[PDB]
Structure formats: structure tokens, C-alpha cells
Scaffold this motif. Sequence first.
Motif, PDB file in Angstrom:
ATOM      1  N   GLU A 274       0.817  -1.220   0.000  1.00 14.04           N
ATOM      2  CA  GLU A 274       0.000   0.000   0.000  1.00 14.04           C
ATOM      3  C   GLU A 274       0.856   1.278   0.000  1.00 14.04           C
ATOM      4  N   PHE A 275       2.012   1.246   0.653  1.00  8.06           N
ATOM      5  CA  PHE A 275       2.912   2.402   0.654  1.00  8.06           C
ATOM      6  C   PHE A 275       3.513   2.629  -0.724  1.00  8.06           C
ATOM      7  N   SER A 276       3.791   1.550  -1.450  1.00  9.67           N
ATOM      8  CA  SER A 276       4.218   1.626  -2.826  1.00  9.67           C
ATOM      9  C   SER A 276       3.165   2.252  -3.732  1.00  9.67           C
ATOM     10  N   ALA A 277       1.922   1.854  -3.512  1.00 11.03           N
ATOM     11  CA  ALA A 277       0.813   2.396  -4.250  1.00 11.03           C
ATOM     12  C   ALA A 277       0.666   3.912  -4.001  1.00 11.03           C
ATOM     13  N   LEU A 278       0.775   4.324  -2.747  1.00 10.82           N
ATOM     14  CA  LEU A 278       0.640   5.736  -2.390  1.00 10.82           C
ATOM     15  C   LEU A 278       1.774   6.570  -2.953  1.00 10.82           C
TER      16      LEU A 278
ATOM     17  N   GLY B 190       0.555   5.172  14.714  1.00 10.45           N
ATOM     18  CA  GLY B 190      -0.343   6.326  14.577  1.00 10.45           C
ATOM     19  C   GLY B 190       0.273   7.607  15.098  1.00 10.45           C
ATOM     20  N   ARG B 191       0.960   7.522  16.233  1.00  7.06           N
ATOM     21  CA  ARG B 191       1.594   8.699  16.798  1.00  7.06           C
ATOM     22  C   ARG B 191       2.702   9.230  15.875  1.00  7.06           C
ATOM     23  N   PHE B 192       3.480   8.328  15.307  1.00 13.73           N
ATOM     24  CA  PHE B 192       4.516   8.680  14.353  1.00 13.73           C
ATOM     25  C   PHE B 192       3.919   9.367  13.116  1.00 13.73           C
ATOM     26  N   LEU B 193       2.826   8.819  12.604  1.00 11.15           N
ATOM     27  CA  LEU B 193       2.191   9.296  11.382  1.00 11.15           C
ATOM     28  C   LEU B 193       1.575  10.699  11.555  1.00 11.15           C
ATOM     29  N   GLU B 194       1.275  11.083  12.794  1.00 10.47           N
ATOM     30  CA  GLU B 194       0.796  12.446  13.101  1.00 10.47           C
ATOM     31  C   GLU B 194       1.729  13.510  12.521  1.00 10.47           C
ATOM     32  N   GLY B 195       3.031  13.219  12.445  1.00 15.04           N
ATOM     33  CA  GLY B 195       4.020  14.169  11.919  1.00 15.04           C
ATOM     34  C   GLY B 195       4.151  14.289  10.399  1.00 15.04           C
ATOM     35  N   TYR B 196       3.324  13.550   9.676  1.00 17.16           N
ATOM     36  CA  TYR B 196       3.343  13.485   8.207  1.00 17.16           C
ATOM     37  C   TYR B 196       2.013  13.949   7.618  1.00 17.16           C
ATOM     38  N   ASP B 197       2.074  14.516   6.419  1.00 16.90           N
ATOM     39  CA  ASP B 197       0.898  14.922   5.637  1.00 16.90           C
ATOM     40  C   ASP B 197       0.833  14.028   4.393  1.00 16.90           C
ATOM     41  N   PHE B 198      -0.378  13.846   3.864  1.00 17.46           N
ATOM     42  CA  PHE B 198      -0.681  12.920   2.766  1.00 17.46           C
ATOM     43  C   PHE B 198      -1.470  13.707   1.698  1.00 17.46           C
ATOM     44  N   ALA B 199      -0.871  13.866   0.527  1.00 17.43           N
ATOM     45  CA  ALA B 199      -1.450  14.640  -0.562  1.00 17.43           C
ATOM     46  C   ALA B 199      -2.525  13.798  -1.235  1.00 17.43           C
ATOM     47  N   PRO B 200      -3.503  14.466  -1.899  1.00 21.38           N
ATOM     48  CA  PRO B 200      -4.525  13.672  -2.600  1.00 21.38           C
ATOM     49  C   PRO B 200      -3.926  12.812  -3.707  1.00 21.38           C
ATOM     50  N   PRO B 201      -4.382  11.560  -3.786  1.00 23.49           N
ATOM     51  CA  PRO B 201      -3.846  10.662  -4.818  1.00 23.49           C
ATOM     52  C   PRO B 201      -4.134  11.186  -6.220  1.00 23.49           C
ATOM     53  N   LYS B 202      -3.144  11.117  -7.088  1.00 22.31           N
ATOM     54  CA  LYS B 202      -3.271  11.551  -8.484  1.00 22.31           C
ATOM     55  C   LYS B 202      -3.740  10.415  -9.401  1.00 22.31           C
ATOM     56  N   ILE B 203      -3.581   9.182  -8.919  1.00 16.34           N
ATOM     57  CA  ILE B 203      -4.149   7.973  -9.524  1.00 16.34           C
ATOM     58  C   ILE B 203      -4.846   7.257  -8.351  1.00 16.34           C
ATOM     59  N   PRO B 204      -6.092   6.751  -8.540  1.00 16.88           N
ATOM     60  CA  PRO B 204      -6.792   6.157  -7.402  1.00 16.88           C
ATOM     61  C   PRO B 204      -6.063   4.948  -6.805  1.00 16.88           C
ATOM     62  N   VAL B 205      -6.079   4.868  -5.470  1.00 17.81           N
ATOM     63  CA  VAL B 205      -5.446   3.806  -4.690  1.00 17.81           C
ATOM     64  C   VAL B 205      -6.527   3.083  -3.894  1.00 17.81           C
ATOM     65  N   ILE B 206      -6.601   1.755  -4.029  1.00 17.26           N
ATOM     66  CA  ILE B 206      -7.610   0.971  -3.332  1.00 17.26           C
ATOM     67  C   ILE B 206      -7.062   0.552  -1.962  1.00 17.26           C
ATOM     68  N   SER B 207      -7.750   0.954  -0.892  1.00 13.06           N
ATOM     69  CA  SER B 207      -7.334   0.652   0.490  1.00 13.06           C
ATOM     70  C   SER B 207      -7.521  -0.790   0.907  1.00 13.06           C
ATOM     71  N   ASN B 208      -6.511  -1.354   1.577  1.00 11.15           N
ATOM     72  CA  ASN B 208      -6.643  -2.686   2.143  1.00 11.15           C
ATOM     73  C   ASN B 208      -7.737  -2.770   3.230  1.00 11.15           C
ATOM     74  N   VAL B 209      -8.025  -1.658   3.906  1.00 13.37           N
ATOM     75  CA  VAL B 209      -8.977  -1.641   5.025  1.00 13.37           C
ATOM     76  C   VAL B 209     -10.401  -1.687   4.522  1.00 13.37           C
ATOM     77  N   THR B 210     -10.695  -0.878   3.506  1.00 17.15           N
ATOM     78  CA  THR B 210     -12.057  -0.730   2.987  1.00 17.15           C
ATOM     79  C   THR B 210     -12.337  -1.457   1.669  1.00 17.15           C
ATOM     80  N   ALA B 211     -11.288  -1.858   0.951  1.00 19.93           N
ATOM     81  CA  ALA B 211     -11.412  -2.407  -0.410  1.00 19.93           C
ATOM     82  C   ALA B 211     -12.050  -1.415  -1.375  1.00 19.93           C
ATOM     83  N   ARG B 212     -11.866  -0.117  -1.118  1.00 22.74           N
ATOM     84  CA  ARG B 212     -12.394   0.963  -1.933  1.00 22.74           C
ATOM     85  C   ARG B 212     -11.349   2.081  -2.071  1.00 22.74           C
ATOM     86  N   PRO B 213     -11.583   3.033  -2.998  1.00 23.02           N
ATOM     87  CA  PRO B 213     -10.611   4.124  -3.146  1.00 23.02           C
ATOM     88  C   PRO B 213     -10.353   4.906  -1.863  1.00 23.02           C
ATOM     89  N   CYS B 214      -9.079   5.236  -1.653  1.00 21.30           N
ATOM     90  CA  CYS B 214      -8.628   6.111  -0.594  1.00 21.30           C
ATOM     91  C   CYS B 214      -9.150   7.531  -0.832  1.00 21.30           C
TER      92      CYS B 214
END
Length: 282
Positions: free
Chosen positions: A89-93, A203-227
Motif C-alpha cells: 500500500e505504501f508503494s501504491a501511495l 499512529g503517533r509517528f504518522l501524526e508528523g506526516y501529511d498525505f497529498a490527494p492521490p493523483k491515480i486512485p489507490v484501493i485501500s486494504n482496510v475498505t477495499a475501496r478508493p482512498c
Amino acid sequence: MKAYMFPGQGSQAKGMGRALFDAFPALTARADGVLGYSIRALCQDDPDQRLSQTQFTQPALYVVNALSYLKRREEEAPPDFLAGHSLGEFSALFAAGVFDFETGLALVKKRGELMGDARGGGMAAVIGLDEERVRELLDQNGATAVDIANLNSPSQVVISGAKDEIARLQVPFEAAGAKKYTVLRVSAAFHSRFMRPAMVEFGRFLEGYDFAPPKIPVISNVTARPCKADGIRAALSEQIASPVRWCESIRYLMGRGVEEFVECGHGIVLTGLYAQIRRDAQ
């Protein structure tokens, strides 16, 4: 339409990525800088025998997957969708422009460290039983400390939890018709409740990072739907203690009109799963 599928833990092998390091020498050097060791040597020679330890597997997979993507981007038409399996999933993002190469590497370095430090539990890969048959077996045999870690295809499920339960369940699962029941050579019960402490720390570590909107849709392992941009940070820590909904993710893509499913990275693990998903869905 076309989707790229990025592999995860268990797909690595000595020799992975060999031609990519010379094709992308700046990114290879920058990975070495983030990691503190040679990524070429780890992947090609595995001199400390640590390619199978998740703290090292995860950066290896991420780099090989990333460089594999950059090569496809140079050589082929763009994909319509992206999906990656757990680490993948990190590769996809990265492929989607959610973060850059070095930022993703830092995330997976931490992910690997936290998961590698986890103690407790084990995992088994099961072939020949559907999800409901697996759940029935867990209930009927009183295995209250076992979770479903991966839903990989209609006949391929990975379970995760207490080591004793994982061991004793081989007999009833084989008796039920499991074609194969394999206790995984892994350090802990990944994608189960045993990861809840690591999830909180990540989760605490990830608080320090920002995530830009995907430019190509990425399907989440949690929801099985687009992020969606606003939910990516939270889902990335949730994901490590939740089931990987891979089969449903591929079925969702089939339903959107994707007919070409290409594995991007080393090996054919996800290619094999795709073949089993396609057969059932058609």
C-alpha cells in the motif's frame, strides 16, 4: 483499464531488483542514506541473512516496488488504478504522488522497525477454504485468539494469533479440506489484535506526516475501496491490526472495468491471486 498491484511481505527473494539499482542510481544512493546500509547488497547478496526479517524486508520491497513503478512509468501507458498488499500500500501511495520517494521510505523503515519489535503470536496460510468455512472452524474449535489477517482469494486466507492455537488448528483445518495449511516463518501475529500496541505507536509517528490527494486512485486494504485524502493517515495505522481485504479490492477493480492486472515489483505472488479471483468472478 489497467491496475498495478504492488507486493508485500513474503514475496521478497535474494536477487530482487538487480537491474533497477543501476537504472536509478540517484534514488538508490538516497535510499542508502535514509536506511544506513546498501540496499543493493541487501537485495542482491543478503550478506547478513536479514532479507526475511520484516524490519529489512519492508524497505527492500518498498525500494524495488518504487523503482519497478518508475521503470513502467517510463516505458508503458499510465495505470488507471493502484493497489498494494500491506507493505505494498505504501508503494501504491508513492505511485499516486501522496508522498515522495524518501518520505515513503521513512514511513516503511518505521513500520518495519515497529512490526519487527512486536512479540507474540504467529500466522498460517490456508489454501482451499473460503472465509466462512475458516470462521466456522475457528469458532467450532474454540480458537478465540485467532483473527483473519488476509483475505487473498476465494480459496486463500491467512489467519493470525496465538501460536498454540495456530499450531493446533492444522488438524481440523486439514480435516475440513484445506489443501495446504502452512505455519509462516514470521516473528509475530501481523494483521491481528496482537498488533494493537504497534498500531498506536505507528499512529503517533504518522501524526508528523501529511498525505497529498492521490493523483491515480489507490484501493485501500482496510475498505477495499478508493482512498480519500483526509482518511489516509488514520487508515495507515488501522491497517496493521485489521484484515487485508485483497480479494474484495481486486473484485472492486474488476467491477470498475479493469481487465489488465499487472504486478509491479518482484515476483508473481499477486499475479497468482489475481488468477484465482478472476476464475471465481467470471
